[model samples]
Target: SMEQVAMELRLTELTRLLRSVLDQLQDKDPARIFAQPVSLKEVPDYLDHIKHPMDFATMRKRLEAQGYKNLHEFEEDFDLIIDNCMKYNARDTVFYRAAVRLRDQGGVVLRQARREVDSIGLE
Candidate 1:
C-alpha cells in the first residue's frame, strides 16, 4: 500500500499547496471567491486557458476560494472501473479508460504550466 499511501500524501500536499496559492488570489477572502460553483469536469478546460502556473495557480486559488471541490466524489466509479480493468472481471474497464483520459488531460495541464513558467523566466 506504499504507493497508494504515497499517492494520497502527495496529492494532499499538492492540494494544500494549490489551495495556499489560491488563497492569495482570493485576497484572503474565501467567502467572496469559494462561493462560486464549478463542476469537476470543467477543471481540465479551465486549466487549458492558463498560460502559466502562476496563472493556473491563480485560477485554482480562485476556484478553491469559491469552494470548488475535487472529483474524488467519484471514487466509487473509479474503483468500479479499475476493477473491471482487472484481467479477470473487467468490472472497471470504464474507470480504467477514464483514468487514461484523465492522465492525458493532466499532462496537457502540466505541460502548459511548465511552458508558462519557462516563459516567465522562472525555474
Candidate 2:
C-alpha cells in the first residue's frame, strides 16, 4: 500500500503538471500562430531553416503516445518549438516576437509546475 500510494500520487502530479503547461500555452496563443505547425505551403523554407521542428500539435501527439517520460521531456519540446520559431523568423518579424513572448510566459508556467512538484516532495 505504501509504495503503490506514493506512485499513484506522483503520477497524478505529473499528469496535472503536464496538462497545466499545455492548457496555459493554448490560452496564451490567441493569435493561433503556435497552435499548429509552420506550414511548408505557407513558408516553404521553414524546414530548411529549422532542423528540429516542433509545435503544439506535435506536443499533443507525443503526449498521447506517452513519449514524454517526465516533465523535463515535455519542457524540452516546448522550448524547441520556441527556438524553431526564433530561428526561422527574423528578429523584427511578428513570429519572432510571438516566440519571445511565449518563451517568457511558458517559463512562468514551467517554474510554477516545478514548484508545485517540489511542494509535494516529488522530483
Candidate 3:
C-alpha cells in the first residue's frame, strides 16, 4: 500500500536525518563520527558499471552503531530484545528505535561540541 511505503520512507528519512546531523557534529571532531563507525565509501573505478546496490547488512550496521549497546534490562532479557530485532520480523522498528536511543545520547555530545566551537571562536 502507498501508506506502508510512505511510512517506511519516512522512517528511512528520519534515520538519515539523524545520521546527517550527527555526522555534521562529528565534523567538528574528525577523530570520531557519531552515526558511522567506519568510513563507508569504497574506492572503485570511475566508470565501473553499476552492479548490485548496497545490501541490508551495510545499512543495518550503521543503525546498529546508533543503537545503545547496553541497557538496564537483565542479561537474558536484553539478549532476547536484540535477538528479536535481528530476526526477520519487525527489524525496521527495532533498528529505528535503537538508533533513536543513540541519537538522544549523541545529542548531548553534540551540544557540548557546539559550545566548544563557540568558545573557540570567542578565543
Q: Pick the candidate with the highest lDDT.
A: 2
- Model 1 lDDT per residue over 1-123, tens place: 898776665555445644543343334332232224323375555334422222233355444453323323222322222232232224456534543454344445445544543464322
Superposition TM-score, candidate 2 onto the true structure: 0.82
Tens digits of per-residue lDDT for model 2, 6-118: 87667666766677679897677778788888888988887777888888998988766656667778889998988888877789998899889888877888888878766
Candidate 3 residues lying further than 4 Å off, grouped into runs, are 33-60, 64-123
Residue 101 of candidate 3: its Cα lDDT?
Answer: 48
Compute each candidate's TM-score over C-alphas. 0.28, 0.82, 0.29
Q: Is 1 or 2 the stronger prediction by lDDT?
A: 2
Predicted structure 1, TM vs. truth:
0.28
Output the worst ten-in-a-row residue range by lDDT, candidate 3. Answer: 68-77
What number of clashing residue pairs does each candidate have, in the order they appear?
Answer: 13, 0, 0
